[PDB]
Amino acid sequence: VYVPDEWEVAREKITMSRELGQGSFGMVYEGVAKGVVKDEPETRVAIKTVNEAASMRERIEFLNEASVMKEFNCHHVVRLLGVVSQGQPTLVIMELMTRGDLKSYLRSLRPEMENNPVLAPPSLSKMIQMAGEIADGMAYLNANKFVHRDLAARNCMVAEDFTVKIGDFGMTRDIYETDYYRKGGKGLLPVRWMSPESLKDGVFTTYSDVWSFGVVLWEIATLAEQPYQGLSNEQVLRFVMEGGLLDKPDNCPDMLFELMRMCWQYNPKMRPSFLEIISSIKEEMEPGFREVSFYYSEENK
Numbered sequence: 001v002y003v004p005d006e007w008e009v010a011r012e013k014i015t016m017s018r019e020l021g022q023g024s025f026g027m028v029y030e031g032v033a034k035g036v037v038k039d040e041p042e043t044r045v046a047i048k049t050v051n052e053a054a055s056m057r058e059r060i061e062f063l064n065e066a067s068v069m070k071e072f073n074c075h076h077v078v079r080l081l082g083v084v085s086q087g088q089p090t091l092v093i094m095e096l097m098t099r100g101d102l103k104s105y106l107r108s109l110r111p112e113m114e115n116n117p118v119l120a121p122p123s124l125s126k127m128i129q130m131a132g133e134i135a136d137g138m139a140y141l142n143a144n145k146f147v148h149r150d151l152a153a154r155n156c157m158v159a160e161d162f163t164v165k166i167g168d169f170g171m172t173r174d175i176y177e178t179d180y181y182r183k184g185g186k187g188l189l190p191v192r193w194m195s196p197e198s199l200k201d202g203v204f205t206t207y208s209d210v211w212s213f214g215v216v217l218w219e220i221a222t223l224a225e226q227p228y229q230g231l232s233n234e235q236v237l238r239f240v241m242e243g244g245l246l247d248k249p250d251n252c253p254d255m256l257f258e259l260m261r262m263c264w265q266y267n268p269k270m271r272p273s274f275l276e277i278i279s280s281i282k283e284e285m286e287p288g289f290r291e292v293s294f295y296y297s298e299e300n301k
């Protein structure tokens with residue numbers, strides 16, 4: 001297919017500058033755009049591109065995949081701002097998140113270890129604020145009839161002001177490729193982030209997203225260690241399916257671990273919803289959360 005709509009942006013309104021890094025279809029850049037955020041003449045944006053060698057099938061694929069993001073309008077979900085489908089290079093304009101993916105962010109927080117002072121690990125308040133933002137992006141998606149299937153720190157983005165948001169769907173990368181494993185056929189799956197039921201039948205729901213959310217809290221608490229570190233991909237499958245769980249990270253407040261354990265209930269129906277996760281921590285979120293969140297929006301019921 002490939003049908004241009006109201007998301008179409010004139011190429012002359014875009015300026016690509018520095019590389020952010022490679023995506024599945026090509027290089028992602030930082031840049032500026034005119035008239036993508038209402039009539040703002042200059043908005044710092046992220047620009048997704050298709051490699052110059054790509055085929056017609058590949059460009060149309062990129063446009064249709066990207067286009068799923070058009071439906072969403074949430075402060076805790078990375079925004080699509082525009083599409084450049086007329087002429088080449090094929091572009092998709094998105095909200096810029098200056099601090100990159102949450103897994104790289106958390107790992108950059110680990111001590112350097114060569115005698116210089118270091119910032120103490122994130123406070124429980126800082127962790128709750130990340131949890132609440134992620135959970136809000138996820139509650140908005142669920143209310144919009146979506147099951148994410150790949151919720152993980154590597155798929156959460158960090159803005160200039162440290163706001164965490166659900167990242168652009170299906171971003172491939174290369175850096176976190178070991179976070180995936182194929183037991184079957186077209187089943188290269190994020191096994192260490194999966195619920196016992198999804199590992200059994202390959203079915204994902206809002207409940208299995210809640211399980212992976214608990215894994216994201218553990219990643220936050222461990223500064224993005226590999227979940228089930230001492231185990232091979234095969235051992236993880238058996239260990240999780242048989243009721244095994246991640247250890248309480250060292251120095252992790254019981255309060256944050258209790259929330260992880262709630263997410264990790266063997267029965268999916270016993271796990272809290274994302275609405276329920278937010279309710280339990282709403283008192284702890286920055287006062288601004290009540291004005292920008294899906295949770296506090298008219299759209300929430």
Ligand SMILES: O=C(c1ccc(F)nc1)N1CCC[C@H]1c1nc(Nc2cc(C3CC3)[nH]n2)c2cccn2n1
Pocket residue numbers: 020021022023028046047048078094095096097098099100101154155156157166167168169171173
């Ligand atoms: O880290 C990621 C990334 C993006 C989305 C996601 F869901 N998971 C990872 N990527 C993808 C390629 C470059 C690299 C990436 N992206 C950055 N910011 C982005 C990307 C986007 C939309 C265009 C994608 N908005 N802001 C960014 C800021 C600092 C370092 N990076 N690296």
